Subunit: 199 residues, 4 copies
């Protein structure tokens, strides 16, 4: 089953058949397409067998849906047909299991992030509530905003408008940024440690 | 009966969920939702904090000598999250209680306290590197408020906005809009901005490495 | 003691933006003398990287279009600047390190791809008709989600869909969260293969 | 004469001395019209008292290496009343106060060799690219691809992921394959950088633990 090459030109086929669809085809060497689809099929076959004889549940649910040759049912089929890539390249499996063990830790630290944001978004909706309501109006948007500021995406747009109405403006944001910036750091480290010990 | 349930992953997940939903659903932003469902979620949440008050009066009757920074944290977070009970409340002290109500999450999950102790530890390093960043910012924000001051006082008018500007640049946020105007005057503009970014980058980097090795010494390899 | 040479090559590579009366030209002809002792040094060795030092040093050996062509002028400048790797050896290291990372990176990229296909679909279906400029087809759904993936001013992508569709954030936020965790794993995967050599 | 060679080393006297440098560093001086005149005046006086104190310290420990040179040259400059760049030097006596900034600056200077090298590599990538796009998008959008200078500056902005769609998108609607140019560029840079971070890490643990 394995072999690196094969699997690479197989990633190649799966992908190219996942990305053809379909508006970008108003013209092109249709024997080329015949062959890409044929091959694509030959693959759903390849593992549809190896299966014969936890991740096998997934393997066969996938391969089964990828077996089938509507507007949404179509797009789903596109999605599972591309999922069979995982069955194929078996390092992707070990990797997915790695993520999954990252999930507990990430879920905790994430709860922390939620605490931090809720605080800053309450203090924020209360502070910036009526001066710029599009971001601090209610608590939900307050959080969506603080979440933009967390990821440092054009955050000066949120802050400066408040900085010319309230001198202490940066203290709010920088502290916020800095505090979030710190705990992510411990998330990372924690996973590292948990990834090493677990060995 | 009670000493047992605080250790269940499914209970902690549903409870955490209820706490969050209870702290986020509010208040005229739901001026239309299944009032039956919110009624249920609130009634529950309060039920939960009842369940904590119980658990802790227990751990208390327990210490054979009735006399853990937690104990204080915990019973204050809970006493405060208990009786007061706010909602869509106009100003202004309850608005803030909502915050301790959500702080209960730490009471509901051990690894939260452990993670927090871990962070408080990372604070020494983060603070000294924060001094070094201050120095760098001050050097660049001064060269800057001197060089760029009469050209764009929007961002280099005084020392203060020069620093805010460079903090905006440190995080790489739309920094092309801070520099790119200086480039169409002073051709050296690039040297200034790039050097400051590279330097801040190197220092933040060495910080991360610092902390990483501190934790790493504090466990494995050996 | 190398530095100087880096200086001549680098300099004579970024020099067109009205100075150095004719010292510009000393740097010219002199930056040309550099290649020749590699055209020679390379001969001096006999009885892998040489397929690179040879092709580069050699394409650096070719002269240059007068008041003419300009076609292959620029390609030539690229090779002339590529000699830097031939002379600096620590760069040959760096690059062997990079190419050692290329495999684990290839796999985790396949994975980020699957996430981007699922979200570019989920998302083209949801937002396809409210912002075809970002969501019209797969193509820009993938460019767009990739801009989000790099957190580059991504609140411009999401905030429109947040006026129309209350849940927008669940879509975008999970998209980011998922991506983050997976990228995270990779680093810690790589930053363990390398220490593996050490023990 | 132990008083000094034994006072630069008090946690609390330190944080005091930083608070004061910093203050008499952030205050100076877009605002002194109203604020307790006696108070800012005081702040300058004791700030100066501080540097006088450091001068006495050195002499005193002297009487009984890079950091004595940087410490001597800085406390030396700080003693003075092209030159607006005076006040800058003084802020640097913080590093003379706080052993920790000394240790951290030392470790950063260890970072430099590898960083210079990787920056070479990234210079080479940015060059190949800014050249390729200097040709490709020069006649379509030239306030950022019109010459090597702006192609390199512009590719640096892309490289820090800052507002990058604004560079790439307007080329995307002229050329279908741009995504390939920008996306591959970014992936490359990323890979090389990740190899920097790690290399520096390895470096550091190889400075002790095996
Ligand atoms: C593939 C790329 C490699 C990934 C490296 C992973 C390193 C994890 C860093 C997580 C955040 C930690 C930064 C931090 O705690 O600094 C605090 C400062 C003050 O607060 C800040 O100013 C935060 C600054 C964040 C700037 C955004 C980019 C991160 C900095 C550059 C990454 C460091 C190595 C070059
Ligand atoms: C990891 C931390 C994640 C925190 C992000 C939570 C954001 C919650 C935003 O709520 C939303 O607020 C909108 C503004 O009114 C409402 O329109 C919408 O109905 C509501 O769902
Ligand atoms: C890495 C740490 C860097 C922290 C940088 C802090 C800089 C704070 C800028 O000061 C502020 O400048 C404004 C400009 O007008 C004033 O309005 C305001 O009163 C003043 O507080
Ligand atoms: C980390 C993996 C992410 C990779 C992202 C894949 C990019 C797919 C974009 O497709 C492009 O869409 C354009 C929009 O129409 C077309 O013009 C163009 O022909 C087509 O090539
Ligand atoms: C990782 C290293 C990559 C950094 C690349 C540096 C780009 C050099 C740009 O030069 C600038 O070009 C402008 C355009 O003409 C001139 O106006 C200006 O005078 C000149 O300084
Ligand atoms: Ca960014
Ligand atoms: Ca040892």
């Amino acid at each position: 089953k394995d072999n690196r090459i094969f699997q690479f030109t197989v990633v190649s086929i799966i992908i190219l058949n996942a990305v053809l669809i379909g508006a970008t085809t108003y013209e092109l060497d249709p024997l080329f397409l015949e062959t890409i689809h044929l091959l694509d099929y030959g693959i759903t076959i390849f593992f549809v067998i190896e299966i014969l004889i936890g991740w096998n549940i997934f393997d066969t649910v996938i391969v089964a849906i990828s077996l089938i040759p509507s507007f949404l049912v179509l797009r789903l089929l596109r999605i599972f047909r591309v999922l069979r890539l995982i069955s194929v390249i078996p390092e992707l499996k070990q990797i997915i299991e790695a993520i999954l063990e990252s999930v507990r830790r990430v879920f905790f630290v994430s709860l922390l992030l939620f605490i931090i944001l809720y605080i800053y978004a309450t203090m924020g909706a209360i502070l910036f509530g009526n001066d710029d309501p599009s971001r601090w109006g209610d608590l939900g948007i307050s959080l969506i905003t603080l979440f933009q500021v967390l990821t440092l995406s054009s955050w000066e747009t949120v802050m400066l408008p408040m900085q010319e109405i309230y001198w202490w403006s940066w203290v709010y944001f920088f502290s916020f940024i800095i505090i979030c910036s710190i705990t992510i750091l411990n998330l990372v480290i924690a996973i590292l440690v948990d990834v090493v010990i677990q060995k």
